[PDB]
Amino acid sequence: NNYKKRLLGTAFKSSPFGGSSHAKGIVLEKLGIESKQPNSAIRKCVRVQLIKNGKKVTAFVPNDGCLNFVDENDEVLLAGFGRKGKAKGDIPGVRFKVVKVSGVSLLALWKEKKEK
Amino acid sequence: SSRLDAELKLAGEFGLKNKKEIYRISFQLSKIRRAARDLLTRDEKDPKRLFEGNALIRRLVRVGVLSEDKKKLDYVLALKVEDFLERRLQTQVYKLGLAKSVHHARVLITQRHIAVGKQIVNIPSFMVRLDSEKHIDFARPGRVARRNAARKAEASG
Amino acid sequence: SSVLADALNAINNAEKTGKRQVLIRPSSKVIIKFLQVMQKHGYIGEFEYIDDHRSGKIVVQLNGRLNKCGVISPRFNVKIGDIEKWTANLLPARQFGYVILTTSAGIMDHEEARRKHVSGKILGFVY
RNA sequence: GGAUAGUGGCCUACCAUGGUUUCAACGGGUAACGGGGAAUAAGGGUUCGAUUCCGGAGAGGGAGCCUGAGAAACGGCUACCACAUCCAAGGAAGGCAGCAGGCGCGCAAAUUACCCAAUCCUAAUUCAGGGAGGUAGUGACAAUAAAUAACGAUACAGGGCCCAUUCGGGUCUUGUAAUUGGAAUGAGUACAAUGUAAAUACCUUAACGAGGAACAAUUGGAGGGCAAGUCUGGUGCCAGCAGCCGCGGUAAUUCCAGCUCCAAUAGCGUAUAUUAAAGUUGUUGCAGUUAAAAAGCUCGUAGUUGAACUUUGGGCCCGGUUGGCCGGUCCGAUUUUUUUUUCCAACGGGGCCUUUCCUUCUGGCUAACCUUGAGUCCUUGUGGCUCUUGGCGAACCAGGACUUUUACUUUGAAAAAAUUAGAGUGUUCAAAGCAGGCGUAUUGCUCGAAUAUAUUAGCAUGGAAUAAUAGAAUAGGACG
RNA sequence: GGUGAAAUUCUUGGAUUUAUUGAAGACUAACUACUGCGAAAGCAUUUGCCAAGGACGUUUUCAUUAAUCAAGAACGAAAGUUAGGGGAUCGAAGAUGAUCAGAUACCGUCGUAGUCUUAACCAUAAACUAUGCCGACUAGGGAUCGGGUGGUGUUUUUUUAAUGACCCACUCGGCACCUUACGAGAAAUCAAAGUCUUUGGGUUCUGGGGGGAGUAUGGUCGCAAGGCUGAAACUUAAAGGAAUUG
RNA sequence: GAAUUUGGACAAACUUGGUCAUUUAGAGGAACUAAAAGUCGUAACAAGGUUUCCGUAGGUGAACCUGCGGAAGGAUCAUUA
């Protein structure tokens, strides 16, 4: 007998933690990032504090016309786009990624749906 | 691709019988376990091979199974998929005259009409066995099947 | 330092060159005994004729296919769910096979102790 | 010695230094209740566990108690710590981790309903009680099914089919901006359910009504991996796409939007774990000269491994199960070409012979043999056994005298149900269920509810190959 | 002098060039290779004293004693530390001389330390053969170390033989290496880097995309320099071998 | 019993200090990473224009240079073949 080895490890304790299908949290600032090499654009993202851990994270309002939220107050749900321990990403260091809110998002919808 | 041309195959079965989904998937999985557990003959004549023998061989079936042989039923894995498909009213109830052509069939299978010798059988994918009794029943009455009995010579397979 | 694959890995190590077999370990009731089950089912020729310190008993002519390599193996289980499984070692179900097991009773062959429902150690496997 | 219901350092005393540990003690960690079993397994494995069932442990933290047969108790007290309520200011109360219900918390989970009918439980000879339990409400929450159309039709055909100088006999595919009838056909609503006298308005019937575009589809994708006629208008490295590869710098096969089309469909995304793919954690089953990977060099403890030798090889006796046809059967009772000669397999098992004790003395039985006191059957008497005179060893019980210690491997017993494997049966099929099935219908008959896996350790067994162990060396051998 | 060419310097001080002699510490030329010996690092002057070592030769003596090893340890180049001895040469730092756009260098030349040494530390290296140790088996030839025979070849031993010494030829042993099939590999190449479908003879060790890094922290070792142990966050999709062509 | 109370054994909890394990604040300091490039100088590659790398030790605006002693993972300018 013998021998245990490396790779994926037990110890955890990250930043959304709940491996959450999101993370509710209020919309601290509206920081439209800026594209990485090769591609190039003003990558409209959003910074917010996670009600849960309070911990602050910033992620792409990724939609296509929807800094509709952009409510410094209002509270999205964020939620990572599995890279996993990485970002996509034309979009430079953004970890998780915008979700739904003010709690309720297509993200565009009720009534109609607009687009994006 | 093979994935593709497969996604052709399935649609072929898609009215090589009559379905509209992945009941092809149903029958498929079936064929697995049937085989599978079966193929796990393995083995000898373990008195087990015995019960299991005339057992799974008692798949027969009527409208169902093979004809007269085996033993090796993996043939089914060939058939079954391409055979177990028939049997049931889903198939073997168009091939019996009454039904004008698959479609013009399931609809009555549903729509109250079409009944297996007493009691309807809406379950538009039952199974047939000792069929000669698969009339209309009807109980003014089941019209589409009661007069269009061109099945009066439906000597088919 | 291990009389088994020692010599079966000289028969093995030989017929791949092709020839008329050669010397081996020293004898061993076990060496000679496999170098029997072999002949007794075929494959090898005639276990041979030396006698020295422990070098005694035999050489052993080759003959036939016997392809390829006698199996040496270095564990030891058996019976029912077993034997049948380690019959995956085999070069294919449909006959061919032969798994020179060690059987509580008798240094026997995949079947030769499949015999009277026997089992135990897994000494080796031929062709 | 004290306590205990009772072992014991359980607690006392007195006395002695002990007990564990690298074969991993001790200590640290657990977003740790254990085991049923769950998920993806070619196999081998990863991964999961508090829904049910067992066993445990706790009702805010923490002690201590009365009660008793039984509790360190939750729906009982007592004090402390902690929250926290009504006060005539004096004092008095409490424990939803039981139903409901609220707050809070967060990614995340429903009603202040009805009931004893069932299953059962608790109290004494009843029929009391029971948010145990069962009905409903909420709820595509994971699962079984499965309609959103079915006909041929009339003619327009654009024509394809055997070509004939035949400008088309029309068997025929289909777009049909055109048109038939099918008093079809489910979802709403008088009746009534063998039904829980509440489910009663519930699946089940039934009768009353009911598709000219509504009685109706979706989610995503259309650069490649991926597979989709994919085109037409807007955008210009702006907006945005894009899991990765990459798209976009006016003519965009990836953005935007229409058309179309692809994929799956009452269901599709997206997140996030995991399992597979992954022989990228490898016992099966990896790699290591340069690609990630030999320690500078030898020593050497633990660990892991370690040459071959000792019983063979010959001979005899009873065996049924697969077999060449029914069969206790080897010169034949069948599968053969005939105007006789005609092949027996192989498989495994028990016993006993050979320089070959199985543990056993006292001696305790059988049914087997040495074999004959009386006899025999018939196919050529060793094809059969009634028979009791002398007289087999280990079966074999039980006191009484002795045994060198294990691995392994073989059936075996015993302990759980559901879980899964899997027989049985038309739950309408299915998922399931453990029902059911005959009739001959005034107290009738009838089968079930299997088997399987029981894996480590224990027990019990049969085996003596492979591997340890010990024995007679100054003989303190070895018998009777 | 001194290089590309100069210069800096030395120099009517007797340098640079010779002439006797002695002085000092390094260092062991040439022969030296096709390599000998060592655990490894590493080991070339003379003689001697000290104790070791493989291979050979026999079957001498034992009989299981063994094989590889986390722990733990002995040796470990060079620099570098401690203290003393000296101190030839060269030569970190440091100066200056040229050279450059720029020179803190590369080219001069002085010169500290150090280079040597003894008692003590340090335990790293492209510490190499970048290839673990033990045993097998798988295929040919040549060449340089101990043992066997024929000895022949020329001389010892000499008045001669023989022997002797080298020396030639056939063997074997074990050495260091070379040259070409099956078989292995991504290649290159490999006498193993070989054998096994894809176990298989026993074991020690290390690897799991790059980076972030051999860094953070902890404990230990040390005088110091450092050694030994040794993360995670985050961050990227390529970095990397071999080959083939420009 | 109630009062009441002597000693006990349990033993909450109070205080004060210790010890673990798990988090966490901070002037500032010093890395890194996105980094493709802006600016100085050319270190590596072509004997990269002083062959290159290995320690180790100094010295540096940055890359570096130099000193001992290694390795070719080489210079093939070739005393040997």
Swiss-Prot record, chain A:
Misc: Present with 10600 molecules/cell in log phase SD medium.
Protein name: Small ribosomal subunit protein uS12A
Effect of residue 39 to A: Lethal mutation
GO biological process: maintenance of translational fidelity; maturation of SSU-rRNA from tricistronic rRNA transcript (SSU-rRNA, 5.8S rRNA, LSU-rRNA); regulation of translational fidelity; translation
Full protein stretch here: 27 to 142 of 145
Superkingdom, natural source: Eukaryota
Residue(s) carrying 3,4-dihydroxyproline: 38
Role description: Component of the ribosome, a large ribonucleoprotein complex responsible for the synthesis of proteins in the cell. The small ribosomal subunit (SSU) binds messenger RNAs (mRNAs) and translates the encoded message by selecting cognate aminoacyl-transfer RNA (tRNA) molecules. The large subunit (LSU) contains the ribosomal catalytic site termed the peptidyl transferase center (PTC), which catalyzes the formation of peptide bonds, thereby polymerizing the amino acids delivered by tRNAs into a polypeptide chain.
Location in the cell: Cytoplasm
A cellular-component GO term for this protein: cytosolic small ribosomal subunit
Annotated crosslink Glycyl lysine isopeptide (Lys-Gly) (interchain with G-Cter in ubiquitin) location: 30
Subunit-structure text: Component of the small ribosomal subunit (SSU). Mature yeast ribosomes consist of a small (40S) and a large (60S) subunit. The 40S small subunit contains 1 molecule of ribosomal RNA (18S rRNA) and 33 different proteins (encoded by 57 genes). The large 60S subunit contains 3 rRNA molecules (25S, 5.8S and 5S rRNA) and 46 different proteins (encoded by 81 genes).
Protein family (similarity comment): Belongs to the universal ribosomal protein uS12 family.
Annotated gene: RPS23A
Curated annotation (Swiss-Prot), chain B:
Keyword Ribosomal protein assigned: yes
Main subcellular location: cytoplasm
Superkingdom of the organism of origin: Eukaryota
Cross-link Glycyl lysine isopeptide (Lys-Gly) (interchain with G-Cter in ubiquitin), where in sequence: 152
GO CC term, one of those recorded: small-subunit processome
Keyword RNA-binding applies: yes
Biological processes, Gene Ontology terms: maturation of SSU-rRNA from tricistronic rRNA transcript (SSU-rRNA, 5.8S rRNA, LSU-rRNA); ribosomal small subunit biogenesis; translation
S4 RNA-binding domain mapped to chain residues: 87-153
Subcellular location: Cytoplasm; Nucleus, Nucleolus
Alphabetic keyword roster: Cytoplasm, Isopeptide bond, Nucleus, Phosphoprotein, Ribonucleoprotein, Ribosomal protein, Ribosome biogenesis, RNA-binding, rRNA processing, rRNA-binding, Ubl conjugation
One MF term in the entry's GO annotations: structural constituent of ribosome
Function statement: Component of the ribosome, a large ribonucleoprotein complex responsible for the synthesis of proteins in the cell. The small ribosomal subunit (SSU) binds messenger RNAs (mRNAs) and translates the encoded message by selecting cognate aminoacyl-transfer RNA (tRNA) molecules. The large subunit (LSU) contains the ribosomal catalytic site termed the peptidyl transferase center (PTC), which catalyzes the formation of peptide bonds, thereby polymerizing the amino acids delivered by tRNAs into a polypeptide chain.
Miscellaneous comment in the UniProt entry for this protein: Present with 106000 molecules/cell in log phase SD medium.
Family: Belongs to the universal ribosomal protein uS4 family.
Assembly notes: Component of the small ribosomal subunit (SSU). Mature yeast ribosomes consist of a small (40S) and a large (60S) subunit. The 40S small subunit contains 1 molecule of ribosomal RNA (18S rRNA) and 33 different proteins (encoded by 57 genes). The large 60S subunit contains 3 rRNA molecules (25S, 5.8S and 5S rRNA) and 46 different proteins (encoded by 81 genes). Interacts with snoRNA U3. uS11 interacts with MPP10. Component of the ribosomal small subunit (SSU) processome composed of at least 40 protein subunits and snoRNA U3.
Name of this chain's protein: Small ribosomal subunit protein uS4A
Gene designation per UniProt: RPS9A
Part of the intact protein present: 21 to 185 of 197
UniProtKB/Swiss-Prot annotation, chain C:
GO CC terms, sorted: cytosol; cytosolic small ribosomal subunit
Biological processes annotated in GO: cytoplasmic translation
UniProt KW keywords: Cytoplasm, Ribonucleoprotein, Ribosomal protein
InterPro entries per UniProt: Ribosomal_uS8, Ribosomal_uS8_CS, Ribosomal_uS8_sf
Entry GO MF terms: structural constituent of ribosome
One Pfam family named in its UniProt record: Ribosomal_S8
Subcellular location, record wording: Cytoplasm
PANTHER family according to UniProt: 40S RIBOSOMAL PROTEIN S15A (PTHR11758)
Annotated HAMAP family: Ribosomal_uS8_A (MF_01302_A)
Misc remark: Present with 40400 molecules/cell in log phase SD medium. There are 2 genes for uS8 in yeast.
Family of the protein in this entry: Belongs to the universal ribosomal protein uS8 family.
NCBIfam families listed in its UniProt record: PRK04034.1 (NF003115)
Name of protein: Small ribosomal subunit protein uS8A
